Design a binder for these strands. Structure first.
Ligand SMILES: [K+]
Ligand SMILES: [Mg+2]
Ligand SMILES: [Mg+2]
Ligand SMILES: [Mg+2]
Ligand SMILES: [Mg+2]
Ligand SMILES: [Mg+2]
Ligand SMILES: [Mg+2]
Ligand SMILES: [Mg+2]
Ligand SMILES: [Mg+2]
Ligand SMILES: [Mg+2]
Ligand SMILES: [Mg+2]
Lengths: 86, 130, 213, 25, 149, 98
RNA sequence: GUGAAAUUCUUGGAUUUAUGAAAGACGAACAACUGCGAAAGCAUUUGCCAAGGAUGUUUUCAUUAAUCAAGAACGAAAGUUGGGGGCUCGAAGACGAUCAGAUACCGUCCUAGUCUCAACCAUAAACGAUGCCGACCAGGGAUCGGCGGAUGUUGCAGGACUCCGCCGGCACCUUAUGAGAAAUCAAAGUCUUUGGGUUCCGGGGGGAGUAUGGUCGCAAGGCUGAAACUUAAAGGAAUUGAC
């Protein structure tokens, strides 16, 4: 790792930017995503933010899904998580 | 009776100037023999010397046999409080002679009065300059 | 030390194993110096190693109180339980967190007493961190747990059971294992107990915890 | 000479001058 | 760094490069507009309306789905608050500080923070006056400020 | 001429630190600047332990320790040989002895 | 109590031992090249009250900013005006001791003060002797706060521990290819190859932070602040000797 003389700033390695700060990447990108949380029962289509801040509910039993924390929302053990993307 | 030990309490108080050997009841409200290092010397500088404590310990050993005091609980202490806390020079000899003068020793503890946070120590902010 | 005075013998409470505790003096009868009133020394420091004949508990200290002088004996009772300076000075180590708690719980016998607990954080078996500290927001929860466990095991029947759970480490172990969800908390037990107030002599309840002498 | 004590001497001189000037207004 | 501190923190958000809303967003502009208007009716505010849209209703960014900012939408609908949100919250914080400091005359640390918050309030008010977002006769009166909030 | 990078004390990121009093002269010294030592010793030494062993009532009595944290001002510490004057290159050596 | 003594206390019981009550001050150990705060500064528990940094964010506004004459908040200790409190320590004062002398260093008793409430003062080696904002330029490990991931143990998802990474902070170690009079500095570097923005401020040593005027203060004092005259050196860093 002599210095950037060996790497190319234009085409940097695709995994080293998976670890840098989002602002400090070559092009700024969010670190979050949106996920459609599926409860144990029906009504499995609700969409929630990864770094959510509001305690979302469900139409059935209000089925508390996530708790807001300092980072990613604390999903419950009973709620299944899969992610939706662009 | 014999063998089974009757216990007194020796409140050794060894400062840098004197050395008190004070034998009391378990309560501490009584007193068997109280002799300082200054009684056994003719100069008020040698009171804290180990040999003065040696003599005083010999005398306490002689006194504490006639009343049946066959063992001692030693509570060694120093000036304590806001002043110096290490025991004085005569703290050890006074103990050692107790061992040598046919006297039994029970538990040994240190009861130097330590403050959680004391008043102002004397000498001033610059300290005792020599 | 005089040709006067009387050699009395103390009697530790029945709760311990050995009742004989040294000997004591008093003025015989001279004038207004009554022997019965003069023997209300009411304080005796013992190690609890002698009262149990086991040497590993020498760090403890028991403060007994002379309640009634009868039959050439003194018939003491519990008045406090403290620590020697050796153990306390040995425990406090650098690169460690010291947690101290205290409560003013009350028993059924109206024996107002104050209890103190002391605890220290424990390093894990695989620990490279050289400090093993805790955050104040955690030591506060530890202190709350200490206080609630103290008031839980207390606020119950007479002090007999309270000292029955003092010579062993029942409060200390319970606090130790009720806080492992926060920190390991090694070396937890009651530092000292201070009797804030005694109800009265009550004239007889003392004989319920003493043998036939 | 320590400058602290020189400052003290200057302060004494200043107060004495002030007193002398207040004497005659 | 911070205007009234020595901090140098850089934590913030990072908007995605893709300006178009994501494909899975199947909400029309009318629904988003009605939701925003209803929220503004319920006494909400643009910052705390955007988060409600982001979390409950799965709208990553209002400017993407509807093509315009929340404040512009409210102003076009005429539901916009008479005072900008940031100035409103600064005034609320200053009012709370003054209410607390009334009974604690020796708390000479909240007096300093009060001076700081009043300076921020005045700077923001001057800016909003320069851009005609406030009446030119507007003035921050400490005694009657609490009546505003 | 700045003899030391830290100024002879251990203060960074704070402005005030309460003092202590030297155990020999009772001179006020900042807590971080004072030379602090922790000495742990037997109450009775090797010449005494032998004579106190048999004098003890029971053999199970372990001999008690004593622990003391002492603080010294620079003058008392130097005069008592707690810390000596070191060479210019050895001054930076913060490694404790052994 | 002292290097040694005396001033002082004491058979009316000094010093010492045990129990208990009261008073005021102080928060040991834990305590760290650790934390917070604009600085001064801040260290027992618990409750309340408002505030704050950093982190997280696919929330919001849209240049709202940086530094700042004038003008303002806060500002250790000592000091001033009154009320309370008044343990310890202790300027002034007294006495003992040492000394050629001792209005000092050493002992003892002590006044203002040390603590607090309502007001004044506005200074410190108030120091990192290093103004604030911004960019870039070597490496390393440790640590504090937050977050992301992995991991396999806990008398118990989470907490404690281990490993990796990101942001923010206090520092530390090695080395110039840098700078510098050098000590030394990873900023005190990117400077005759001289220009990112902005505030304050120095012009040989004394006289002198003095005189006087102005102004704030009850005062002690603070801010602003010369001139005549005198002088060839004063000073910084390092080197070899001498002590
Ligand atoms: K030091
Ligand atoms: Mg933790
Ligand atoms: Mg020098
Ligand atoms: Mg800081
Ligand atoms: Mg300072
Ligand atoms: Mg403490
Ligand atoms: Mg800390
Ligand atoms: Mg100004
Ligand atoms: Mg100045
Ligand atoms: Mg960390
Ligand atoms: Mg000049």
């Amino acid at each position: 790792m002599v210095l950037q003389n060996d790497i190319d700033l234009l085409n940097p390695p695709a995994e080293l930017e998976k670890l840098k700060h989002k602002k400090k990447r070559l092009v700024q990108s969010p670190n979050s995503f949106f996920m459609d949380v599926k409860c144990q029962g029906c009504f499995n289509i609700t969409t929630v933010f990864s770094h959510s801040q509001t305690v979302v509910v469900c139409p059935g039993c209000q089925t508390v899904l996530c708790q807001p924390t300092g980072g990613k929302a604390r999903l419950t053990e009973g709620c299944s998580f899969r992610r939706k993307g662009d | 009776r014999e063998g089974e030990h009757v216990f007194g309490v020796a409140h050794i108080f060894a400062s840098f100037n004197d050395t008190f050997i004070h034998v009391t009841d378990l309560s501490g409200r009584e007193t068997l023999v109280r002799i300082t290092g200054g009684m056994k010397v003719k100069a008020d500088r040698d009171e804290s010397s180990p040999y003065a404590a040696m003599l005083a310990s010999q005398d306490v050993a002689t006194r504490c046999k006639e009343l049946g005091i066959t063992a001692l609980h030693i509570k060694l202490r120093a000036t304590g409080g806001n002043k110096t806390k290490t025991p004085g020079p005569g703290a050890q000899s006074a103990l050692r002679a107790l061992a040598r003068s046919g006297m039994k020793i029970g538990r040994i503890e240190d009861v130097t009065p330590v403050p959680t946070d004391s008043t102002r120590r004397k000498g001033g902010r610059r300290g005792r300059r020599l | 030390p005089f040709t006067k005075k009387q050699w009395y013998d103390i009697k530790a409470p029945l709760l311990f194993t050995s009742r004989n505790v040294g000997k004591t003096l008093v003025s015989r009868t001279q004038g207004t110096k009554i022997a019965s009133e003069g023997l209300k020394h009411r304080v005796f420091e013992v190690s609890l190693a002698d009262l149990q004949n086991d040497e590993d508990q020498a760090y403890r200290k028991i403060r007994l109180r002379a309640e009634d002088v009868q039959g050439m004996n003194v018939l003491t009772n519990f008045w406090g339980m403290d620590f020697t300076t050796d153990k306390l000075r040995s425990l406090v180590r650098k690169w460690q967190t010291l947690i101290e708690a205290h409560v003013d719980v009350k028993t059924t016998d109206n024996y107002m007493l104050r209890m103190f607990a002391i605890g220290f954080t424990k390093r894990r078996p695989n620990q490279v961190k050289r400090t093993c500290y805790a955050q104040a927001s955690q030591i506060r929860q530890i202190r709350r747990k200490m206080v609630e466990i103290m008031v839980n095991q207390a606020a119950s029947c007479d002090l007999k059971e309270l000292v029955n759970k003092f010579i062993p480490e029942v409060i200390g172990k319970e606090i130790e294992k009720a806080t492992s969800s926060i920190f390991p908390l090694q070396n937890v037990y009651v530092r000292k107990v201070k009797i804030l107030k005694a109800p009265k002599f009550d004239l007889g309840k003392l004989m319920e915890v003493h043998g036939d002498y | 000479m320590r400058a602290k004590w020189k400052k003290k001497r200057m302060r004494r001189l200043k107060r004495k001058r002030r007193k002398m000037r207040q004497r005659s207004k | 760094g911070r205007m009234h501190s020595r901090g140098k923190g850089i934590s913030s958000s990072a908007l995605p490069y893709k300006r178009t809303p994501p494909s899975w967003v199947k909400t029309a502009v009318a629904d988003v507009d009605e939701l925003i208007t209803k929220a503004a009716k319920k006494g909400q505010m643009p910052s705390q309306i955007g988060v409600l849209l982001r979390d409950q209703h799965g709208i990553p960014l209002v400017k993407s789905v509807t093509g315009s900012k929340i404040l512009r939408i409210l102003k076009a609908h005429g539901l916009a608050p008479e005072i900008p949100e940031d100035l409103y919250f600064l005034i609320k914080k200053a009012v709370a500080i003054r209410k607390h400091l009334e009974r604690n005359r020796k708390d000479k640390d909240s007096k300093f923070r009060l001076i700081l918050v009043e300076s921020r309030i005045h700077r923001l008010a001057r800016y909003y006056k320069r851009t005609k977002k406030l009446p030119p006769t507007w003035k921050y009166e400490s005694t009657t400020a609490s009546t505003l909030v | 001429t700045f003899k030391r990078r830290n100024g002879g004390r251990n203060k960074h990121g704070r402005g005030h630190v309460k003092y202590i009093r030297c155990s020999n002269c009772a001179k006020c010294c900042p807590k971080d600047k004072a030379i602090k030592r922790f000495l742990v010793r037997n109450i009775v030494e090797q010449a005494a332990v032998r004579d106190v062993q048999e004098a003890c009532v029971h053999d199970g009595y372990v001999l008690p320790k004593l622990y003391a944290k002492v603080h010294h001002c620079v003058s008392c510490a130097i005069h008592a040989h707690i810390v000596r004057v070191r060479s210019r290159e050895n001054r930076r050596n913060r490694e404790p002895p052994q």
